[PDB]
């Protein structure tokens with residue numbers, strides 16, 4: 161699949177070595193190649209070419225540091241390949257370089273291929289590989305850029321990466337979950353691959369930490385800058401444009417704040433100091449960014465503008481803020497949003513050159529803060545904040561919030577300029593803020609739920625989790641890992657012996673959290689993909705409903721209207737999403753009337769539509785669907801059955817179950833984990849007193865003191881029975897009852913418990929046979945074993 165380049169055999173031969181050597185000499189007479197080499201010789205890395213190659217040749221692991229844009233990503237790979245070609249051994253090269261994101265892997269590969277007077281892929285020297293998309297280069301003497309997630313998937317097919325001669329772990333400052341796992345796997349692989357060469361590269365790095373981690377491996381610094389970059393703090397921004405607005409470290413900030421303002425009045429005008437005093441540290445001043453953008457386009461020379469915002473809500477707000485002005489309405493400006501949830505085609509448009517009289521303005525998240533080179537970028541506006549997930553060990557609650565940027569992220573955002581020409585960087589934090597920023601972000605493995613971490617360790621068969629944790633550079637706490645083990649058992653991704661179930665194997669192959677992975681997996685298995693992908697897309701990210709001030713009464717009445725009789729916050733999103741798609745088919749003006757009428761965000765809805773395509777791609781690579789279309793008729797035979805959908809929701813939401821108590825009109829809700837809870841007023845089941853079932857499933861909790869259920873749907877006890885935990889038959893002599901996880905009790909014939917035990921087992925056999933060669937369930941086949949098992953589960957859910 162995505163392992164076509166890996167499963168080749170590194171077979172060097174002298175005949176190809178001679179062809180590559182002759183091809184290099186013919187390139188040296190090609191005008192397009194010669195002009196590219198003229199630019200390459202100007203890079204700081206070109207002076208270090210002999211030193212870098214000689215050091216990588218004499219040591220197995222090498223740490224390379226250098227200023228942003230000095231040439232690490234695009235030149236080091238070429239230095240290794242061209243050195244082998246000139247030595248008559250070019251075919252022995254199989255260089256793989258990792259990039260943290262798909263936009264980095266694609267654009268860098270296109271750039272390197274262009275620097276070598278070649279097209280990307282097509283059996284040339286350079287190509288790329290990402291999820292379900294690749295331009296593969298030739299077999300021998302080639303360079304392949306790819307995402308770190310591709311290498312992790314490669315380890316499932318070849319844990320030794322046998323055909324790879326050089327692996328380059330690039331942008332290692334992005335200490336994400338997958339990068340830390342891959343780095344620890346490579347370290348263990350060194351002794352088993354004495355012929356392998358490993359290179360570690362970043363611009364903002366505690367290099368000594370990485371060298372010591374890799375057995376005191378040698379370090380090499382690439383000195384020099386490509387182009388200067390002017391840096392501006394908040395005081396410098398307000399002074400230049402004359403802008404007037406129309407936990408313990410904060411105690412240090414408040415303590416030094418009055419003296420800082422006094423020292424600031426001696427270096428800046430009193431008006432700007434007053435503006436600095438009333439600036440808000442809670443959120444990014446989008447009015448200030450827009451005023452700075454206006455100053456750049458009206459007073460400064462030509463050059464694209466790149467803006468860094470924490471999330472999607474900030475990007476769309478600033479975009480509407482600029483588009484509401486006459487100046488940015490015209491075609492002299494092209495405003496391009498950039499979000500990770502966008503299709504890859506939309507992300508690449510940022511690299512397209514603009515007409516000479518047209519100014520490009522890119523509004524991006526941290527997706528654009530590393531690696532990528534945008535040609536015309538001269539001005540970088542750093543909002544100073546970045547979305548970060550945070551996890552508390554005491555209570556199972558994870559929060560996404562806009563946090564102050566670290567010094568490393570700021571240097572990477574500043575690094576997006578000064579690559580092809582001089583630049584300017586404006587940081588929206590004051591000097592006192594700068595002195596209190598951390599050097600680096602906390603590694604994601606130290607501040608997020610670790611269910612994906614544990615699934616990743618188990619799928620690679622790296623031995624016990626305890627041993628692998630001790631080998632990580634920054635190991636998480638054992639209490640956080642045990643909580644993940646408990647959650648994975650309740651999801652039935654791990655059995656009682658902490659071993660992967662068949663379901664857990666497929667969840668480990670899905671690059672999302674297992675709760676979402678389990679929901680989208682059974683949506684494909686039960687042929688209700690489109691409504692389930694919509695629900696999953698809204699559980700991640702956010703729901704499309706908005707509530708203006710004073711409009712709470714009318715907005716609630718709209719939501720209860722869209723819910724019909726489903727008693728389901730998640731089926732309400734489906735109906736709101738479907739009604740939105742039907743309004744788009746009507747027209748653009750009537751689509752806006754629909755969103756305003758029901759208080760729906762067209763921006764959020766469009767983002768949910770993009771997430772649905774990304775979820776379908778994950779299931780496509782996993783082999784559970786046959787196309788990238790979330791509305792493919794193959795996977796939507798049961799998409800208009802409310803009961804099957806609600807079961808798939810329950811499949812993903814368990815064990816987040818709530819029990820309803822009615823008193824003859826009072827309704828009380830209990831969740832076992834936190835006891836009594838209430839229903840959040842935004843939900844559709846707030847004033848509900850008539851329930852067909854006494855059980856709810858939820859996804860989001862809020863406290864807010866007394867626990868509130870953000871989104872909940874009523875669910876049948878037979879959905880909790882099948883997708884639940886342990887099943888026990890309780891005998892009261894007077895009568896028998898069935899229990900799920902002891903507390904979920906309901907009157908039911910005891911033989912149903914035996915049926916569920918047998919149907920769960922057949923589901924495991926179905927998923928087991930899907931492991932070796934995944935194939936979507938052919939629901940057209942009435943007399944098939946896979947459909948018979950799934951039909952029996954469906955009949956149990958319906959009755």
Ligand SMILES: Nc1ncnc2c1ncn2[C@@H]1O[C@H](COP(=O)(O)OP(=O)(O)O)[C@@H](O)[C@H]1O
Nearest residue numbers: 228229230231232233234235271386533579580
């Ligand atoms: N798409 C491109 N168009 C023009 N120049 C580019 C492009 N990509 C890279 N470059 C030039 O090549 C240099 C090397 O970039 P890169 O190797 O990514 O630097 P680093 O790895 O040190 O961040 C950049 O400074 C830039 O000037």
Ligand code: BEF
Nearest residue numbers: 228229363531575
């Ligand atoms: F160091 Be480069 F900007 F990736």
Ligand SMILES: [Mg+2]
Nearest residue numbers: 232233331531
């Ligand atoms: Mg780089």
